[PDB]
Design a protein around this ligand. Structure first.
Ligand SMILES: Nc1ncnc2c1ncn2[C@@H]1O[C@H](COP(=O)(O)CP(=O)(O)OP(=O)(O)O)[C@@H](O)[C@H]1O
Ligand SMILES: Nc1ncnc2c1ncn2[C@@H]1O[C@H](COP(=O)(O)CP(=O)(O)OP(=O)(O)O)[C@@H](O)[C@H]1O
Ligand SMILES: [Mg+2]
Ligand SMILES: [Mg+2]
Lengths: 280, 280
């Protein structure tokens, strides 16, 4: 069991998949979980990006099936821009594809700014662009849970293997959710499901970006990672990649284990086994 | 095993403890974890309540020890009142016991209110007192992670067995943290450690409360739970409790499992095993 193989197993990666079958299993999962909780549906932030576009369509398909089976369910798609979003057009395109039961726009700027201003005033320092970025992600979580709390809906998370292996998400930000329909999927597999679902190609060819920085809006995930999704997917799907690349993927995986586990206690072994861990 | 024995095991409860030894193991844990992360210390919200008073003191002892060992570390105690806290006096007493390296005060009202006003504005509905309360807990998490990110500090969590068994915490609010030094302790045992640390009796005789509601400030945990900590501790320590009390505890434990697990995916078994889950 090489590290690459342990990672593939831990992240539930399927080297080869059947898009129609994956969609069936993932829509079934959303239905099975919600039935267990007695919730009234789901809520999800739609950014115009690939992951939320796919997760959103799966959620709409799920509630429509729940209603067809005689149940009661609704899906609310939520736009969460910080001021004017650079790629609002792509978000609208995603909304057109998702065809959600309900959609609403919630500018998170006033909340994020109220916080940053207060921080600056009381801590005698300004938030670095990166840290304010994480505030944005966390406020998006807050917004989705508030709507979920008010309407009795579960919060959908968009985590998948290509993001999980690098711990490329904000802890308790977009990482905070109730259920994950995309777990185990590589980035390219995600595009494959989108194609099967008949999505406009602009929805899966668009460049992946967390778009949280004020000074570098729309920054490419790969620019930040120093690794391309092509390499990540190759690695995750069990293919051979340059020792150079493998080492970089594996070190990022091992140091971010804390983001894939519940808070650490003295009774947990994962952190003791880890040679090291990095939070900042 | 009885469900009680299963719960005791799952939550790492020790029916009998030696306060002195517990403090040593828990302080050692904080030192061991931070050391493996290269972080510069810890950050924790100090409410004036039992849990943060104890976790706060353990963190201070941990950084003093790290420094005595030739390392570099600091502990920042942070006051997080929403506007003006009724028991600010108890919080001041707590700070005098903790004797943290540094302490700051951060009013979360402007951020929370900015959010609430935007919510009412955009969803044409006001947040219920309970949901606004969760917004407060979540903004407290945001604040600690902001300070942590800015100063390279790990966020301490105050979860313990008496809270874990009932899922009595806000998901991604006070539930969001990096490490938990109090894991496994019953409420009663926590007081024992505080007594061993020579805490002013007011710090552990004070009524437990999340104090998140505008309409019912300082509301007792027991009132909300319908279960006393005296009963929870007896149950957790392996003692006999009335059948009806045990039933209520066990039902709450089973339905709150999702709060003690990372977000659910179709590959997890815990939710499939659960006969029912409760999010609202
Ligand atoms: N501006 C925005 N509006 C709404 N939701 C947003 C958002 N920015 C982030 N989110 C939420 O946060 C999640 C994580 O963001 P990302 O990591 O960038 C994946 P994505 O944006 O959905 O596709 P991507 O990889 O193409 O960038 C999104 O899937 C979405 O649910
Ligand atoms: N007003 C406040 N100021 C600072 N931190 C606060 C706070 N209210 C809540 N917190 C943070 O949230 C955590 C969880 O709150 P509680 O569940 O009520 C435990 P406690 O307040 O510390 O002791 P308690 O059980 O006596 O209420 C606290 O331990 C603290 O870290
Ligand atoms: Mg994105
Ligand atoms: Mg309290």
């Amino acid at each position: 069991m090489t590290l690459q193989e342990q990672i593939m197993k831990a992240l539930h990666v399927q080297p080869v998949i059947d898009p129609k079958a994956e969609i069936r299993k993932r829509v079934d999962f959303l239905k099975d979980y919600v039935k267990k909780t007695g919730a009234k549906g789901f809520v999800l932030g739609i950014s115009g990006g690939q992951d939320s576009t796919l997760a959103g369509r799966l959620a709409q398909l799920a509630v429509e099936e729940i209603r067809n089976e005689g149940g009661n369910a609704t899906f609310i798609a939520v736009r969460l821009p910080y001021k004017v979003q650079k790629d609002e057009d792509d978000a609208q395109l995603a909304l057109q594809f998702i065809q959600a039961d309900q959609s609403v726009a919630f500018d998170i700027a006033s909340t994020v700014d109220a916080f940053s201003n207060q921080y600056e005033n009381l801590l005698d320092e300004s938030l670095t662009d990166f840290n304010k970025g994480n505030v944005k992600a966390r406020i998006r979580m807050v917004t989705q849970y508030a709507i979920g709390g008010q309407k009795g809906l579960l919060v959908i998370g968009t985590d998948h293997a290509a993001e999980a292996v690098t711990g490329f998400f904000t802890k308790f930000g977009d990482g905070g959710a109730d259920l994950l329909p995309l777990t185990g999927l590589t980035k390219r597999q995600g595009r494959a499901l989108l194609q099967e679902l008949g999505a406009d190609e602009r929805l899966y060819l668009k460049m992946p970006t967390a778009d949280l920085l004020d000074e570098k809006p729309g920054q490419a995930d790969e620019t930040e990672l120093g690794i391309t999704y092509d390499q990540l997917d190759d690695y995750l799907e069990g293919k051979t990649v340059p020792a150079d690349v493998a080492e970089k993927i594996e070190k990022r995986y091992t140091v971010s284990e804390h983001k894939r586990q519940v808070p650490a206690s003295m009774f947990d072994d994962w952190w003791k086994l880890a040679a090291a861990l990095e939070h900042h």
